[PDB]
Amino acid sequence: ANVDEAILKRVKGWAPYVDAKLGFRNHWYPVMFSKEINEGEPKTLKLLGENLLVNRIDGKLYCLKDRCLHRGVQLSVKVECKTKSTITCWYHAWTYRWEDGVLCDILTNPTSAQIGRQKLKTYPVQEAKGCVFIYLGDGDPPPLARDTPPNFLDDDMEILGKNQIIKSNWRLAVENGFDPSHIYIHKDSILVKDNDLALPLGFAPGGDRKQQTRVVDDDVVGRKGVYDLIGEHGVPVFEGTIGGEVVREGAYGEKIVANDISIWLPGVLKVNPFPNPDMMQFEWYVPIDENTHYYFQTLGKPCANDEERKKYEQEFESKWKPMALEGFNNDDIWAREAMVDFYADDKGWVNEILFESDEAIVAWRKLASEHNQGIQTQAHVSGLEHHH
Amino acid sequence: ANVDEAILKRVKGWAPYVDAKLGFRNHWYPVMFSKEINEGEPKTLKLLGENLLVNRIDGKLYCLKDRCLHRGVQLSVKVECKTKSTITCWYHAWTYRWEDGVLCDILTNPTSAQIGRQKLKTYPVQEAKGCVFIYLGDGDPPPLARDTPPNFLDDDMEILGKNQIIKSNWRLAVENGFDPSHIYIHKDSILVKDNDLALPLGFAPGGDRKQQTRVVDDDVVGRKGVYDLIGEHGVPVFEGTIGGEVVREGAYGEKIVANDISIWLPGVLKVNPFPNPDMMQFEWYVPIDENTHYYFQTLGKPCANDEERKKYEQEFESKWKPMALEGFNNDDIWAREAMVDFYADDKGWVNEILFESDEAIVAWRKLASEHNQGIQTQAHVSGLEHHH
Amino acid sequence: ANVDEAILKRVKGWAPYVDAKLGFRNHWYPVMFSKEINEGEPKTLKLLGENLLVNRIDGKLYCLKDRCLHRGVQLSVKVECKTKSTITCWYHAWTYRWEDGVLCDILTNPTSAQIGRQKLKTYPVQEAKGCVFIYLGDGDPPPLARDTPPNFLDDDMEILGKNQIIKSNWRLAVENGFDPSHIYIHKDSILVKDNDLALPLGFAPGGDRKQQTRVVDDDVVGRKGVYDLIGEHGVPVFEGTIGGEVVREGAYGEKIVANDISIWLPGVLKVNPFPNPDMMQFEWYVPIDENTHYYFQTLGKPCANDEERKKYEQEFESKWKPMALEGFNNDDIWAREAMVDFYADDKGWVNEILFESDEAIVAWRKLASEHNQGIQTQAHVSGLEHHH
Ligand SMILES: Oc1cccc(-c2ccccc2)c1O
Ligand SMILES: Oc1cccc(-c2ccccc2)c1O
Ligand SMILES: Oc1cccc(-c2ccccc2)c1O
Ligand code: FES
Ligand code: FES
Ligand code: FES
Ligand SMILES: [Fe+2]
Ligand SMILES: [Fe+2]
Ligand SMILES: [Fe+2]
């Protein structure tokens, strides 16, 4: 659908994933934090190539396609919300209900036969853990838990985070995050020295192929994901040699992190514990268009009361955000960016030469291929085909 | 020719118009004002995708294709007019006559067998009402009147105006201008308050389909156009309601404007009277390339002598230009711009959902389809095919 | 391979040359000066569309493809040379030898089965006359002399020069340089007045077609090129006339230059003597990508000892560089640039109308077509096709 059939033919193992340049339809995705959207102040964003509007009305979020049915302009060019329940296109005043997208009035012609007989696409929106999720899909949504990693929605789990737009395809981001050997790029992170981390350079794998991961399709809430098990039969590498000469060493700090690493559909990584033994990291790589994603980073820590919550928050702002989310993950950003050119023409998928630790990535590509809930296409983006 | 055959098949009603992305060949178009081009000071512009040079020689305008026959460079990169009758290419000094485009000399080789045996394309140029029109077409031109709205060329009609380059396809501009319901976007114009205009929000149409317009193919000078008659059987809308609640009102001033609205091939709108009961507006949307047009705005007022002419001019500069041509029509510019994305892939033509007041636009699309004098193509732009 | 088959069919005379948009593979090309690359300080450049790294190790130059075999990132994003013999990719620490490109270690997994079993492409590099040449080709290189003009590699010949990136295809540059009538564009050069040059406006050719050039395929070092002989039977033009009227004259200085003009594969011009009777100019137009070339300019003067060498150098810096390489050849840069649009869609090759002095260019197009050592293609650039 999105990629040259000749390339798709050559990746048998994982063709749906190679075709899913625009992401997977019929999943939940986080797009902003709750606190970024106030009552009666609509926001625009692009998700899976679709321009969307989000509004908060009597405290509740609603999401409309930001494209008028009439002449295809963005309503957001000049927002006119003239009743709490509605938005009016600035051009010829077609008026839509936030609740169901129905065209309920046309100010320029209240006799129009179109009234009541057209409807703008809406998507479900839910807030959880101070995060706004959109179900970019058709029909009744699944529970959010299906599309979130374990423990993210636990009652006591306190989530704080950061979001930004990054110029790479979302798959380059997923793969970088779940890539065991990419830990090499983090060897000089301020986080490593300043938080006294143990951090190898890499891994000498052991065991068989199947032992390198746990593929999860037996989670009772219907989550689908892969655990990275390279360290169970594998040996961490702390000394990097060239021709037998040690030229680089790993980090020999005390704090043990990243015991459990798992990637989940639609594209969220959970690293536990990280960046400190008492907290976890959940990060999403949300498709905006073929070239760009939201890097939606969260750190979670179980907190028992408002006191714990407020100090977590203060540590987050003074330490974990600059030192970890920025000081550790900034290198991930430019690593993703550096793979853009090779994958741009869809040929990186066939001309890459993988090595042993990439078994984790292969397992993900296969899981995503088999268990995604739909391939987003340009027809989804450009819409229904009329023959008037 | 310009658009995917599959799309053209789906717009039966008006396929030539959908194909005419680059505009209609074999019409007159205004491109600048007379006062902008002085004796012996050639100017460059692009019209229907073609790079042109215009010069004034003994008071008269001439137009040459700005592309040397030899290696295809623009002569205008470095203009060398070394005799009044000629221009010399800066590269190998092929020299062309302004009057007929004939290659009359080559300074670098006066023995060349090419001399007298090659000719650059020329186009007819006429000045009228202080406006420079180019006939972008082949063969002997029609009278200018054929391609101008009624009354524009009347003896007493004094024309003043403004020109600029706007980033939309020319058809988006035509349609916006001739769109009865688009009056909604003008509801907050400074012109409306400050010139005490009556201006509805829209129209409740009445009568039959055919009564909504007058299609003109019986004009004796051969003009072809459409009058917008929505107000003859229709009722203006001054109260905009949502769920029966009045949320916006029109403008209840005294001055009645825009009694007669007509669109004419090749793409010129006449609104009478406007922006004041004693004057009219004529505006062209001239194709530059597929993405851009000249928005060539003129206001006309019958003046009996130099006294009337000079005060018209002073009102124009102090009032009508800032208040009307800018303060009213600026909103039209960004409205055009907002339709670009939907129409960019040629699919807006099939995926738009039209309503009743768009009958005027449909009538234009059909008139333009039937009565245009040719479809400009990329072959016109890139030129004659040689097999040397 | 690179151009629409329908266009290639129409240039029978010279189709390989029209197809060679990215240049000719299996030739030597100069890319920088020796003094620009220091011991242990690798540099990045693009040549024939390929991203390359060059390093100096124990005084000797080596060239590796700047694209990791693993995930296709540029090694140069963050260079890690951790042993003199090697470079380590910043991402997962695949480590390559400069000498043969072999993957000799992987810091992230020293047990990997890939080690010793993969190799990055290398290219031969030679320095001569203070210029760095890369053999962008496969297999054992020819002698450099094959791909350089006569006398460039003479022992006593002292070469100084300048390099920059110019935004045109390399062929537009070659043709401009070897175009006899293009001398017109140089008629106002500061060099002409300030160095008292004789410089005609052009040439009235005489003799037959074959007499206009000498095609060289009998050089014993295997050079292939064309001498421009237009002045042997032709008469220089010093008076430019339009309708018989003299409107421009040539330059009637004393110093006679450019007696011998020759173009050589892969695309180097030699003008002798120039810009002074006692020196010569050699200039390369090196393909970077389809849109851009290095304009690699050198001036050569036989020098007998260090005294002559040092004064040559001082004249070069104070006079010949600003006055000739800049003051004369700057006009060549913008002339090349002005042909870009006509040749951009590959149609200039068929829609150009050539005249008599272009016989030199035709002879080159045919020589290049017949004697080039390979057509660079996008498959060369994007690489070997794997079916893992
Ligand atoms: O995307 C990510 C975010 C945060 C931590 C890691 C990590 C993985 C392995 C070892 C150390 C850190 C990661 O991959
Ligand atoms: O393009 C245009 C230029 C000037 C005036 C109008 C107009 C049309 C209807 C009602 C009021 C003004 C317009 O369409
Ligand atoms: O590329 C070039 C570089 C330097 C000199 C010339 C030249 C050619 C003919 C006559 C005069 C100068 C040239 O073509
Ligand atoms: S484009 Fe929105 S009402 Fe017309
Ligand atoms: S390109 Fe104009 S004379 Fe050669
Ligand atoms: S991309 Fe270079 S080692 Fe992985
Ligand atoms: Fe990372
Ligand atoms: Fe308007
Ligand atoms: Fe030159």
Question: Is residue B89 in contact with ligand 5, taking CB distance under 6 Å?
Answer: yes
Report the Cα–Cα distance between both ends of chain C, in Å, rounded. 26
Q: Which residue type occupies B312?
A: Y
Mutate to test the pocket of ligand 6, among C65, C73, C74 (most ligand atoms within 8 A of CB): C73
Backbone angles phi, psi at A10, to 5 degrees: -80, -5
Find, among C260, C264, C297, the residue nearest to C281 by Cα: C297
Listing DSSP states for C309-333 in one string gives HHHHHHHIIIIIIIIIIITTTHHHH
CB contact under 8 A, C242 and B110: no
Residue nearest to atom 5 of ligand 1 (CA): A271
Across the interface, of C72, C85, C105, the residue whose CB is closest to A342 is C72
Taking the C-alpha atoms of residue B234 and residue B242, their distance in angstroms, rounded to an integer, is 21
A204 CA distance to ligand 7 middle (Å): 18
- State the distance from the centre of ligand 6 to the C-alpha of C104, rounded, in angstroms: 14
Close Cβ partners of A300 (under 8 Å, ≥ 6 residues apart):
A129, A151, A152, A157, A158, A159, A279, A280, A281, A282
Q: Which residues of B touch A91 (CB under 8 A)?
A: 182, 184-185, 335, 338
Method: X-ray
The ligand that comes nearest to the alpha carbon of residue C297 is 3
Contact C368, C20 (CB under 8 A): yes
Is B91 close to C248, i.e. CB distance below 8 A?
A: no
Q: Are strands A27-33 and A131-136 parallel, antiparallel or unpaired?
A: antiparallel
Residue for token digits 């009624």? B150
Buried b (16+ CB within 10 A) or exposed e, A182-219: bbbbbbebebbeebebbbbbbbbbeeeeeebbebbeee
User: A282: which residues sit within 8 A by CB, 6+ positions away?
Assistant: A148, A149, A152, A159, A268, A269, A270, A298, A299, A300
Give the CB-side neighbour count of residue B92, counting CA atoms within 13 A. 27
Cα angle value A206/A212/A217 (rounded, 5°): 160
CA dist A147 → A161, A264, B247, B316, C20 (Å): 18, 7, 41, 63, 51
Strands A260-264 and A225-228, by their bridges, are: antiparallel
The three-state secondary structure class of A273 is coil
Asked whether the beta carbons of A71 and B351 are under 8 A apart, the reply is no
**CA C254/CA C199 separation, integer angstroms:** 10
User: Any bridge partners for residue C157, and if so which?
Assistant: C302
Residue C72 has its nearest CB partner, among A241, A352, A357, at A352
**A&B contacts, CB < 8 Å:** 120
Residue whose token pair is 């047009």: B293
E strand segments, C114-264:
122-123, 125-128, 131-136, 157-166, 198-199, 202-204, 213-216, 225-228, 235-237, 239-242, 245-249, 251-252, 260-264
Whether residue C352 and residue B387 make contact (CB cut-off 8 A), yes or no, is: no
For residue C336, which of C387, C380, C294 has the smallest C-alpha distance?
C294
| Contact between chains at A113 and B357 (C-beta distance less than 8 A) | no
Residue B30: which H helix or E strand, with range? Answer: strand B27-33
Task: Give the phi and the psi of residue A226 in degrees, each rounded to 5.
Answer: -135, 130
- Resolution in angstroms, to 1 decimal, for this deposition? 1.9
Atom of ligand 6 minimally distant from the CA of C75? 2
Q: Using the 8-state DSSP alphabet, how is residue A142 labeled?
A: P
Are the beta carbons of B358 and B20 closer than 8 angstroms?
Answer: no
CA quadruple A316, A322, A326, A329: dihedral, nearest 10 = -60
Find, among C182, C289, C163, C174, the residue nearest to C225 by Cα. C174
Residue B78 C-alpha, separation from nearest chain C C-alpha, in angstroms: 10
Of A237, A347, A354, the CB nearest to C108: A237
Q: Cα B379 vs. chain centroid, distance in angstroms?
A: 22
Residues of C with CB under 8 A from a CB of A: 67, 69-74, 77, 82-83, 85-86, 88, 90-93, 95, 104-114, 118, 382-388
Cα separation, A182 vs C108, whole angstroms = 8
Atom nearest to A72 CA in ligand 4: 1
- The answer to whether the CB of B115 is under 6 A from ligand 5 is no
Task: Name chain C contacts of B105, Cβ cutoff 8 Å.
Answer: 241-243
Structural contact between residues C22 and C290, judged by C-beta atoms closer than 8 angstroms: yes
Which ligand 5 atom sits closest to the C-alpha of B75?
Answer: 2
- The full length of chain C comes to 388
**Token couple for A33:** 């934090």
Closest residue CA from atom 3 of ligand 5: B92
Which of C96, C107, C382 would best serve as a mutation to test chain A binding (most A beta carbons within 10 A)? Answer: C107
The C-alpha torsion from B364 through B365 and B369 to B374, rounded to 10°, is: 80
Inter-chain residue contact A354 with C70, CB threshold 8 Å:
yes
| SS3 call for C286 | strand
CA of C309 to the centre of ligand 1 (A): 59
- Alpha-carbon distance values, B299 to B285, C106, C114, C320 (Å): 15, 75, 76, 60
Q: What's the gap in Å between B198 CA and the centre of ligand 8?
A: 15
As a whole number of Å, the end-to-end CA separation of chain B is 26
Task: Please state, in angstroms and as integers, the Cα–Cα distance from residue A16 to each residue in A12, A171, A269, C45, following that order.
Answer: 9, 12, 20, 36
Q: What are the angstrom distances between the C-alpha of B5 and each of B15, B18, B288, B346, B365?
A: 10, 11, 24, 11, 18
The domain limits of chain A are 4-25+139-383, 26-65+121-138, 66-120
Nearest CA to ligand 3 atom 5: C271
**Contact partners of C by the rule of 3+ C-beta pairs under 8 A?**
A, B
Q: Tokens representing B260?
A: 């007669």
DSSP string for residues in C19-55: H-TT-BSSEEEEEEEGGG--BT--EEEEETTEEEEEE
Which one, of C116, C63, C64, C62, lies nearest residue A243 by Cα? C116
Of B72, B104, B109, the CB nearest to C342: B72
